[PDB]
Amino acid sequence: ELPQMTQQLNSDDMQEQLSATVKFRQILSREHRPPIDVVIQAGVVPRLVEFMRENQPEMLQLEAAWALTNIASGTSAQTKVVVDADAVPLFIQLLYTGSVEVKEQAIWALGNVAGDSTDYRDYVLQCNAMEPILGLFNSNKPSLIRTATWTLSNLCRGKKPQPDWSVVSQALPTLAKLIYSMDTETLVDACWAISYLSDGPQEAIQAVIDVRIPKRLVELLSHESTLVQTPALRAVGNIVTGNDLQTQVVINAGVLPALRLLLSSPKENIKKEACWTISNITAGNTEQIQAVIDANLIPPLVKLLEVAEYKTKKEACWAISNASSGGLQRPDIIRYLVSQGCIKPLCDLLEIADNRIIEVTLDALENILKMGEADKEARGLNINENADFIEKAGGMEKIFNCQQNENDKIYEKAYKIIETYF
Amino acid sequence: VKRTVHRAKKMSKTHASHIINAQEDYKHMYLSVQPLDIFCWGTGSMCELGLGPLAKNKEVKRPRLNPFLPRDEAKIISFAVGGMHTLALDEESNVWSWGCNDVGALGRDTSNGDLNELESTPAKIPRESFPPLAEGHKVVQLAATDNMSCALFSNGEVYAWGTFRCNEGILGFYQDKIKIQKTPWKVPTFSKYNIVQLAPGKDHILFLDEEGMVFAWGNGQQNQLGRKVMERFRLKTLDPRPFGLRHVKYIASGENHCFALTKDNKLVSWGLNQFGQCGVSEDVEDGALVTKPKRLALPDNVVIRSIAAGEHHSLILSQDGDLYSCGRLDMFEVGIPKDNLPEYTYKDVHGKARAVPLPTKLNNVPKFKSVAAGSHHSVAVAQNGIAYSWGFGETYAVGLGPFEDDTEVPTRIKNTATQDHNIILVGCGGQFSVSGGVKLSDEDAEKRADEMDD
């Protein structure tokens, strides 16, 4: 069939070209094991990209871009054939000239190209693909905006060499509307693209928050399945990495009563990334700690600090340890923390954790002890009782056995707080 | 101070869920890739030729260029030939119409030589008659029966007008609710999936969705509808309805018999089999009716490209260019000479061959790339681009010249209007034919003339 298809593809009859281009697209559209190398070996790729020129008829451009789309969907080497045929600019040209069908066809091929590696993602951006892609979001068909959003997800993607912030930041006003969609497959790609952009310097975190987005990101923290909860939680997770006037805005959209709903989610990664978000909001103003205090988020966090696994207890410790840090301005944060049963899960965490968590757990146990030091001086006492229940849970022995580890910073602190209070 | 810390990157575009077919798999068969010069020949006694009202144009014995469809401004892209009328869409998706309008098959008004100038001259159907056109949609296929027209849109919506005729009088158009439909009309949806292909017959029409289900609409006295209709519930059930035909890739229909190609490359047919036109059984005295779809036995290396059939004959065109015919011999419809008649040809009570009841490959013919079949004549274009017509010739529908004898074998159509042309689309009616094509460059016609006439 291939020698016939190749001969029919190279015939000067344009109608025979169309019938042959349909056959190539059909065999390249098979669900399993598409003969990409076999048609690449057939030498017909340079003629497929020939069928996407400005002058070529629309039916021929459609079948050609579709066949090239499934060629680029294969190995990173098979995608190299399509880009070395100089096809990416023609894909972008069809985003302007052709109808809705070919536009949905070419935006699919550009998505496979931009998703292979980071150099191809920049190459797509290098050819000014952003302006035509963003213009495609005024159309009607939910499948066109579905494929366009997915391609736009691969454009905001990649972190080893991040996408050009200038050419990519133009898409957030379009993404701000895409979250309001109901098609479950589109908004998932739309949320991931936002989480990819919300990660970076403050030029991006302030940009994401300045375009009306984070209000719905908490509304999509509450969705049916988890396929959308994860990208939206990562989105609101990268927002709190900025300053405290940036985290203050997410708190407005009822983020905290929504984070508790995620703390009991069936998927464990939703539990963990919730604790990672609760960690950074407890690292701002002392009144931003109070937001986490009143939101009833700590009773479930301290039980996570006991029974949950180490990948989730670590981020739960950061949330609890950063919470106790607010005791300098307001010593009652520890007073609220000690009542929820916080000292025992912290102390039992001493033997199972590592250099990086024993550090923050000691910082939590220290700021707890530092509050009780001010409790026995301003208030009439002669014994610091923040150390009374540390060993009631068996913590004084573990902190005394933390002086044996050879890490500098933990020996300097475990030995300092044990002389200061014991 | 603050701490900063699968999903698919590539994705092939394949079929979704239960979808077997896509409209893009079909529009290359019907819509030409470039505007065409339209050529008509045969007898236009009922305004079929579309060449004007003058009686001089009522009978044309060789392909004649239709000036009412100029390639430069009309820009006809596709056309569907019925039995006494044809339809045609241009490059801006406006359907044209010309023929007999006794039952509103032309979808336009006609009231106010011998022919009617409004019927004998092609003209557009009002664009406002197609709401999908205003909603940003295009017509991807046209279909025309004897007395009913149909237009398939790129969104899956179907518009139809005209009527179907039973054997006695007029059967109706749609489900007792409307006798005759004069203007384009929206057929209410009859499937969860979008229709992808049409297959018109004499007084019936088939449909095919992305799922692979086949629907039938119209007359069913010869079991064209894939079922049986009782006299009482006849008008009540007159609408596109399935009949247990699933997993179909391609449909085609004669006048009272139909074909369907399944996903596993299995060709079945049903309906009327008076002269073995279904190509399913060797005995013709046995079954005049094929109620249940029966499989045809084609060779193994065959891959079906298109299927055209008339009233009593069928033509199966393969991808290798070979043409398989089966059906009536009384007017040389199948195009098989008398010396090359196979063993299984049917001789009647008088001893005269009447039909070939099995698919038989034509020999000593060029490789064909398309084929069309009228009531009792056929046209197939070869790979170079030249037409070869055969069959009933008393109405000059074969367009071979001023002679009234039938032609036994596919013979070349050669006149000054068509010799320098590469014809793309061909359709056939009751007693006429329509071809469309593009003119070759003076050097491309130089080589083909050296290939043939040497």
Numbering used by the authors:
A (entry chain B): 88 to 509
B (entry chain A): 2 to 6, 16 to 122, 141 to 482
Task: Give the article text.
Eukaryotic cells maintain an intracellular gradient of the small GTPase Ran that is predominantly bound to GTP in the nucleus and GDP in the cytoplasm. This gradient is generated by the asymmetric distribution of Ran effectors: the guanine exchange factor RCC1 (regulator of chromatin condensation 1) is sequestered in the nucleus bound to chromatin, while the GTPase-activating protein specific for Ran, RanGAP, and various accessory Ran-binding proteins (RanBPs) reside in the cytoplasm.
Unexpectedly, in the yeast complex the β-propeller is positioned onto the surface of Arms 1–2 of Kap60, making the complex more elongated and slender than the human counterpart (~135 vs. ~115 Å). First, at the minor NLS-binding pocket, yRCC1 residues K3 and R4 make close contacts at positions P1′ and P2′ of Kap60. Third, a ‘loop-helix’ motif (residues 24–46) lies immediately C-terminal of the yRCC1 major NLS box and connects it to the first β-strand of the β-propeller (residues 47–51). While the loop (residues 24–32) makes no contacts with Kap60, the short α-helix (residues 33–40) packs against helixes B of Arms 1–2, sandwiched between the yRCC1 β-propeller and the concave groove of Kap60.
